[PDB]
Amino acid sequence: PPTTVLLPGAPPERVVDTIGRGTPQVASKVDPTAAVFRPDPTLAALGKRVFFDPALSEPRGMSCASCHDPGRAFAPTLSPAALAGPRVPQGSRPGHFSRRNAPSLLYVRYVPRRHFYQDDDALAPAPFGGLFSDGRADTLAEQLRGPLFDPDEMNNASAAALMRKIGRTGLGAALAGRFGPSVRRDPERMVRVLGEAMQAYLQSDEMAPFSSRYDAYVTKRAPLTPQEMRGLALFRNPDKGNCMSCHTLSDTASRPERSLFTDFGYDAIAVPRNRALPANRDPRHFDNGLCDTAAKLRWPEPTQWCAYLRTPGLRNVAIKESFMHNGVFDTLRDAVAFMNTRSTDPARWYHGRDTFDDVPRAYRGNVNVNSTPMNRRPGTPPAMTDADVDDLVAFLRTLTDARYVGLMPTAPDGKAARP
Numbered sequence: 454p455p456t457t458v459l460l461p462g463a464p465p466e467r468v469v470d471t472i473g474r475g476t477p478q479v480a481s482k483v484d485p486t487a488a489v490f491r492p493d494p495t496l497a498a499l500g501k502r503v504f505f506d507p508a509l510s511e512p513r514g515m516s517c518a519s520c521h522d523p524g525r526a527f528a529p530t531l532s533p534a535a536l537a538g539p540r541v542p543q544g545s546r547p548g549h550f551s552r553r554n555a556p557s558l559l560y561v562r563y564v565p566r567r568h569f570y571q572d573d574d575a576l577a578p579a580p581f582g583g584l585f586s587d588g589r590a591d592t593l594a595e596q597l598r599g600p601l602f603d604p605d606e607m608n609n610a611s612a613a614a615l616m617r618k619i620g621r622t623g624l625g626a627a628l629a630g631r632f633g634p635s636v637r638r639d640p641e642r643m644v645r646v647l648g649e650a651m652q653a654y655l656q657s658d659e660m661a662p663f664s665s666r667y668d669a670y671v672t673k674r675a676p677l678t679p680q681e682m683r684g685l686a687l688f689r690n691p692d693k694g695n696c697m698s699c700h701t702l703s704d705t706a707s708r709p710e711r712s713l714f715t716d717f718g719y720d721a722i723a724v725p726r727n728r729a730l731p732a733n734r735d736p737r738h739f740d741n742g743l744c745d746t747a748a749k750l751r752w753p754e755p756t757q758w759c760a761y762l763r764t765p766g767l768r769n770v771a772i773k774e775s776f777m778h779n780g781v782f783d784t785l786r787d788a789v790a791f792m793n794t795r796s797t798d799p800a801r802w803y804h805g806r807d808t809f810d811d812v813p814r815a816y817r818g819n820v821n822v823n824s825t826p827m828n829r830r831p832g833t834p835p836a837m838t839d840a841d842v843d844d845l846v847a848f849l850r851t852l853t854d855a856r857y858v859g860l861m862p863t864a865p866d867g868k869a870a871r872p
């Protein structure tokens with residue numbers, strides 16, 4: 454096709470090729486700020502009701518909010534068992550856990566549909582977009598099927614069973630009131646309209662507040678501290694932090710939405726294995742990220758994408774209880790320190806081993822060793838000092854939306870609060 458629309462309301466994008474089974478390659482970068490969100494207010498309110506309804510799990514008692522706490526920027530507040538164990542959300546039953554850490558859902562409306570784009574300084578197109586860290590859902594409506602029917606999360610047996618359960622409650626009556634009686638008879642329609650309602654909620658302005666001190670710096674040049682400005686400088690310095698090369702920002706713009714702190718692209722940084730995750734009880738099992746989606750979509754040579762994961766946005770990062778797709782780090786400073794010394798000090802991060810412990814041998818070539826600061830060899834000085842790392846942490850704390858600032862720690866290596 455000549456064009457494709459990758460975010461709601463956005464200008465159509467020129468398609469220059471199709472990769473595998475329907476993934477468009479576009480001619481220009483998607484600008485997430487060009488999207489236009491106009492969710493129907495009562496539809497959004499219905500989606501919010503769904504989001505907080507604990508009847509939607511098996512056994513009952515777990516809602517979306519059980520892993521996406523509104524008091525923590527819709528990132529998980531871990532159960533005591535999860536905090537002591539794998540550091541990813543607990544599912545609907547004791548001893549069952551998500552396969553990955555759950556992100557904040559604030560700003561999720563800006564995640565575009567899957568597409569490829571080849572920058573001027575690139576030999577091949579790169580993948581962007583898709584929901585989940587492996588991009589396996591193209592839209593928010595499609596995403597909903599994941600947690601609802603995952604035995605380790607909300608654990609509904611089938612769409613039919615979920616439909617029967619909902620149909621018997623006030624939620625079923627409300628859905629039938631808006632959509633008509635067939636939502637109580639057709640399980641496919643039930644799932645689809647739940648997705649439409651959830652999409653409206655998650656696309657509402659409530660779910661993209663832009664209320665951080667960084668945002669006040671962008672809109673009004675309200676001053677940050679000298680330390681925070683040192684961290685901002687390191688963050689956009691290609692020779693020190695180089696963070697801006699993947700966690701996109703525009704600190705000279707005046708619109709906060711030009712700073713989402715991700716380009717929604719993918720890379721392979723090889724964070725350490727979290728052996729507390731149930732799936733990793735098999736030492737031959739690895740969560741390989743994007744290549745599972747690439748295989749499903751018949752992208753050519755799909756294992757080139759093994760160990761690739763979607764670059765997360767960093768807004769509200771400093772109130773999370775664990776970090777990276779596998780929750781392996783429990784402090785923000787450790788995540789930043791890892792970026793700086795994975796390549797120079799692998800034994801620190803991989804239990805004395807000199808190379809990655811969560812990437813199969815076959816896929817080690819996929820790991821990024823070219824981007825600063827991951828491009829320095831063992832025994833050479835890292836790009837940044839421990840003081841630089843502290844300053845980066847100080848800067849990342851400016852990305853917390855106003856209502857959540859009290860959850861942040863004060864010590865550079867501190868953990869988010871559990872009030």
Ligand code: HEC
Pocket residue numbers: 504515516517518519520521542543544545551552553554555556558561564583584585586587593596597600601605606607651
């Ligand atoms: C804990 C058991 C979960 C429950 C209950 C819900 N979600 Fe969640 N969510 C969870 C994890 C571990 C992740 C990441 C999984 C991965 O493979 O990356 C997610 C992700 C999402 C997303 C995508 C966010 C993104 O890619 O940026 C969305 C939009 C989302 N979750 C929505 C959502 C809904 C609406 C829920 C109730 C129906 C729901 N989640 C429950 C963990 C858990």
Ligand code: HEC
Pocket residue numbers: 556688693694695696697698699700719720721722723724762763764765766767770775776777778779785788789792793821824825826845
């Ligand atoms: C592109 C090559 C990257 C650069 C340069 C930096 N980061 Fe990044 N980051 C990248 C990816 C692919 C991921 C996900 C990895 C995973 O296993 O999940 C990350 C993750 C983060 C995190 C975790 C955020 C969370 O929500 O869990 C943090 C805190 C982070 N990165 C910080 C960070 C800093 C400060 C950087 C400059 C020193 C930086 N990253 C560079 C990809 C890329």
Ligand SMILES: [Cl-]
Pocket residue numbers: 534535538547548
């Ligand atoms: Cl447990």
Ligand SMILES: [Cl-]
Pocket residue numbers: 706707708711
């Ligand atoms: Cl602007």
Ligand SMILES: [Mg+2]
Pocket residue numbers: 818819820821
């Ligand atoms: Mg490579």
